[PDB]
Amino acid sequence: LMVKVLDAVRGSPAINVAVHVFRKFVEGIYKVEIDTKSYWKALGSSPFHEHAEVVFTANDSGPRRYTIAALLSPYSYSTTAVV
Amino acid sequence: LMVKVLDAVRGSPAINVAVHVFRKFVEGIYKVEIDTKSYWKALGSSPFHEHAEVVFTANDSGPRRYTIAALLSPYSYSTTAVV
Amino acid sequence: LMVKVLDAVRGSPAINVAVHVFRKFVEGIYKVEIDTKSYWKALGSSPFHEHAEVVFTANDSGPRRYTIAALLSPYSYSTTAVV
Amino acid sequence: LMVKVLDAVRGSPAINVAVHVFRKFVEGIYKVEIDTKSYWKALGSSPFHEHAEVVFTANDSGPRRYTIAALLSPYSYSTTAVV
Amino acid sequence: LMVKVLDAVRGSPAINVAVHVFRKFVEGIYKVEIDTKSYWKALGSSPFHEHAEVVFTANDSGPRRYTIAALLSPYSYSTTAVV
């Protein structure tokens, strides 16, 4: 078994590398998260077993704008602006 | 077994690399998430078993705009703008 | 078993590296999180067993804007601005 | 078993490295968190067992803005500004 | 078993390194946290067992702004400003 990555580099690059090797167990190597809203996750073992009265209401209001100039997209010789 | 990636580089590139090798177990290598809304996930083992009264209402209001100049798309010699 | 990454570098790069080797257990190597809102997570073992009255309301209001010039995207020779 | 990273460097780079080796257990190597709001986490063993009256309300108001010039994205020869 | 990182360096770099080796248990090597608000965590063993009346309200108000010139992103030859 031989694994070789990026033996020689002369210029000035910008590089993201992730090498995983498994031989004979979870993992997250590059993760980004924005505005994650999850309610009532993994709610116990036996809740609300016999009798329950629940008023579930959720409110998040307002004009929401998302601007991304680049999502998973590098450049080499470029100009990028978000006015 | 021999695996070789990017032996020699002379210029100045912008590179994203992910190498996985399995030989004889989950994983997320590049993940991006925006505005994920999941309600009542993995709700216990035996909830609401016999009698239940649930009022489930969800409200998220407002004009929503999403602008992405590039999603999974690199450039080499370009100009990119989002006015 | 031989694993080699970035043997020789001459210029002045900007590099992110993560190497994982498993031989015969979780892990997070690069994680970023912004505005994560999760309510009632892993709620005990047996809560609200017999009788319960719950008024669940959640409010987060206001115009919300997110601007990202680059998400997982390096540059080599560029100009980037967010006015 | 042989693992070699960055044998020789001559210029002046800016490098982030994380090497993990497991041979035959959790861990977080690079973590960043901004505005994490999680209510009622790991709530005891058996709370609210028989009778309960709960008024759950949450309020966080105001225009909220997030500006990030770069999230997981290095540069080599660039200019970056956020006016 | 042989692990070698950064054998020789001649210039003047800025380097962050974390090496972990396990052979046959938790840990946090690089952690940053800003504005973490978690209420009622690990609430006893059996609180609020039989009868309870709880008024849970939370208020944090005001326009909130977050500006980050770089999050997990080094430079080599750059200029960075946040006016």
From Swiss-Prot, chains A, B, C, D, E:
Phenotypic consequence of A58G: In AMYLD1; amyloid polyneuropathy
Effect of D7E: In AMYLD1; amyloid polyneuropathy
Effect after changing V55A: In a patient with amyloidosis
Recorded consequence of changing S38Y: In AMYLD1; amyloid polyneuropathy
GO CC annotations on file: azurophil granule lumen; extracellular exosome; extracellular region; extracellular space; protein-containing complex
Tagged with keyword Ribonucleoprotein: no
Outcome when changing Y30H: In AMYLD1; leptomeningeal amyloidosis; vitreous amyloid in some patients
Glycan attachment sites: N59
UniProt main location, coarse: secreted
Consequence when changing Y75C: In AMYLD1; amyloid polyneuropathy
MF GO annotations: hormone activity; hormone binding; identical protein binding; molecular sequestering activity; protein-containing complex binding
Impact noted for substituting I34V: In AMYLD1; amyloid polyneuropathy
Keyword tags: Amyloid, Amyloidosis, Cytoplasm, Disease variant, Gamma-carboxyglutamic acid, Glycoprotein, Hormone, Neuropathy, Phosphoprotein, Secreted, Signal, Sulfation, Thyroid hormone, Transport
Function: Thyroid hormone-binding protein. Probably transports thyroxine from the bloodstream to the brain.
UniProt miscellaneous comment: Tetramer dissociation and partial unfolding leads to the formation of aggregates and amyloid fibrils. Small molecules that occupy at least one of the thyroid hormone binding sites stabilize the tetramer, and thereby stabilize the native state and protect against misfolding and the formation of amyloid fibrils. Two binding sites for thyroxine are located in the channel. Less than 1% of plasma prealbumin molecules are normally involved in thyroxine transport. L-thyroxine binds to the transthyretin by an order of magnitude stronger than does the triiodo-L-thyronine. Thyroxine-binding globulin is the major carrier protein for thyroid hormones in man.
Disease tied to this protein: Amyloidosis, hereditary systemic 1: A form of hereditary systemic amyloidosis, a disorder characterized by amyloid deposition in multiple tissues resulting in a wide clinical spectrum. AMYLD1 is an autosomal dominant form due to transthyretin amyloid deposition. Protein fibrils can form in different tissues leading to amyloid polyneuropathies, amyloidotic cardiomyopathy, carpal tunnel syndrome, systemic senile amyloidosis. The disease includes leptomeningeal amyloidosis that is characterized by primary involvement of the central nervous system. Hyperthyroxinemia, dystransthyretinemic: A condition characterized by elevation of total and free thyroxine in healthy, euthyroid persons without detectable binding protein abnormalities.
Family recorded in the similarity comment: Belongs to the transthyretin family.
Record note on domains: Each monomer has two 4-stranded beta sheets and the shape of a prolate ellipsoid. Antiparallel beta-sheet interactions link monomers into dimers. A short loop from each monomer forms the main dimer-dimer interaction. These two pairs of loops separate the opposed, convex beta-sheets of the dimers to form an internal channel.
Name by which UniProt lists this protein: Transthyretin
Species assigned in the record: Homo sapiens (Human)
Residues of the full protein shown: 32 to 142 of 147
